[PDB]
Structures are given as C-alpha cells and as structure tokens.
C-alpha cells in the first residue's frame, strides 16, 4: 500500500571490536595506568568509569554529569 | 519480551514454592500484588508464564480477567534443573 513519506530507517548502532582495552594504558612493569577517573558514585563505584566528552564528564547509570 | 533475569527467577521461585499461580490481565499495573517484596511489573509475570506455556511447561486456564497457570511434569523437571535445586523437593501441591 502507497505511503506519503520515504520512511526513516531505524538507528543501526556502531558496534566496535574492543572499546575496553582503550580504558587502560599498559606498562612494561607488572603495574597499571587508569585512564578515565573512577567516580565514587552511590551504586556505580570502581569498575564504572566516567565519560570523557568534548564539553563535560558523565557517570553512566546514576547520571552524574560534570561541567569542565 | 526483553526481561530482567533477577525478576524472572523470583517469578520461577514463587511458581515452584506453590505449584499453581494466578495473574490478572492488566499489563499497565505498576507492581505485581503478590510479589511486592520484588519490583515486578504485571506485564513481565504474564510474558514469562505465556513463554513457559508455548513449550508446554504450564497449564493455561482463563476466566473473565485472570490467567490461571498450573504446573505440569515438563515444567517441574525444567524448573528444578534450571534453579539448580535438590531433586527431592516439590511444589506445595504434592505434600499430602
């Protein structure tokens, strides 16, 4: 059956191979280098990193965004 | 249905604890009346139990505005091997 508009195709997401290993810097010792600050947020503490956007920071699930 | 497994296992736990279960057809009911200890939307109890039914694990009987779900032998065996329990214990319907 004929419609008015040529439709909007649904948002297909950009799936990526390992966005994880870009969360840490590797050392040649047996030590570490944590890239993005760890928010001590109510529920989402240690393993939950903050977002590093071009204008502000953002904590994922508690939604705790920060002006630079 | 897209489901939280936490809520899904809590439904399966109560279903076992008492073999048969009742659910009103009201998909826009915020919390389930019985399991108010858990945050269970009525939609999710219905969708879980109708998914159980499709394979022939539960017995579906419908009145005016209430689903009635009795447990079968197929459901008994799936539910017990799934929750990873002692094989001896059974629903509240069997014990004399």
């Amino acid at each position: 059956k004929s419609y008015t508009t040529p439709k909007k195709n649904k948002h297909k997401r950009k799936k990526v191979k390992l966005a994880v290993l870009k969360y840490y810097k590797v050392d040649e010792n047996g030590k570490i280098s944590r890239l993005r600050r760890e928010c001590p947020s109510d529920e989402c503490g240690a393993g939950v990193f903050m977002a590093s956007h071009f204008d502000r920071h953002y904590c994922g699930k508690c939604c705790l965004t920060y002006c630079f | 249905m897209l489901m939280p497994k936490k809520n899904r296992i809590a439904i399966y736990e109560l279903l076992f604890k008492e073999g048969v279960m009742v659910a009103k057809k009201d998909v826009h009911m915020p919390k389930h009346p019985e399991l108010a200890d858990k945050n269970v939307p009525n939609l999710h109890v219905m969708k879980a139990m109708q998914s159980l039914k499709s394979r022939g694990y539960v017995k579906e009987q419908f009145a005016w505005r209430h689903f009635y779900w009795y447990l079968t032998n197929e459901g008994i065996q799936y539910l017990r091997d799934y929750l990873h329990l002692p094989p001896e214990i059974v629903p509240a319907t069997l014990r004399r």
Binding site: - | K25, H28, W64, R65
Partner: protein, 55 residues
C-alpha cells in the same frame, strides 16, 4: 523517556477510567451497589448474583 510517555495520560475519571470486570469494554456499565459489570454481562449473570424478575 519512552516509560515517561507510555502510561503518561492520567485516568481518575471518565468512562476510559472504569472497566467491565467480565469482558473489559467501556459502554452501558452497571456501577450500582458496586457491581462494575456491563449491562449485557450483568443481564447474563444477573440470576447468579441474586437479582430476580418479580414485578
């Protein structure tokens, strides 16, 4: 928010608020004595509730 919009509209009154306790439709409802049964469903089950044609 999808879940801020799905059941966003308020229902405290009108005939979209109240529902037939049998067939679930929204015309010719009996609300007298807290029945909440549509007139056709009432008339079907009327003798089982206790209502009797005398006069």
């Amino acid at each position: 928010g999808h879940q801020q919009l799905y059941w966003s509209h308020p229902r405290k009154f009108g005939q979209g608020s109240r529902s037939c306790r049998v067939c679930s439709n929204r015309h010719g409802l009996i609300r007298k004595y807290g029945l909440n049964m549509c007139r056709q469903c009432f008339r079907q089950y009327a003798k089982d509730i206790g209502f009797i044609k005398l006069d």
